[PDB]
Amino acid sequence: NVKAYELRTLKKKELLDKLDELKKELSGLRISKALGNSAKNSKIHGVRKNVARVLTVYNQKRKMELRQLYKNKKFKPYNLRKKLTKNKRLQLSPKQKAAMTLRQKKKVQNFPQRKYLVV
């Protein structure tokens, strides 16, 4: 019954081998359950949770690695790109909407909305 942080430091090859041997052990426990045995049925849940955690840490490591491979470059793959909503992605940029012509820009700069108080 391994834990997450104590795997968060392992090398990928050892992690994969650990996963393979855990799968083999789980298969053996399934053999035991299927055959007339009814004793070792408990540890199967622990094994099925161990393999899940190992897979999760492996997948997260792979995701960080394959994000690091593609720093910036303005052409991130679609899955590695944003996952906002459709009309958020297709929404006008804030700079795009705030952009305005020199005519009105100059007019507003010369005559801005201004604070004041009365007697």
């Binding site: 604070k115 004041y116 108080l117 009365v118």
Partner: protein, 53 residues
């Protein structure tokens, strides 16, 4: 019609359940408007919201 009454003049001959809408929310809408305008003037650094006409 029955004897000495005004001639009926009811314009309800068409469907009107479809369009009846009473206003329970008069006073609370008034309160909401008050709060909104108060916040609008408070956020404006004390400058009166009203304009000369």
């Amino acid at each position: 019609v029955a004897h000495n009454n005004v001639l009926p003049n009811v314009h309800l001959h068409k469907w009107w359940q479809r369009h009846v809408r009473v206003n329970f929310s008069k006073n609370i809408k008034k309160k909401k408007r008050r709060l909104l305008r108060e916040k609008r003037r408070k956020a404006n650094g004390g400058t009166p919201i009203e304009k000369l006409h």
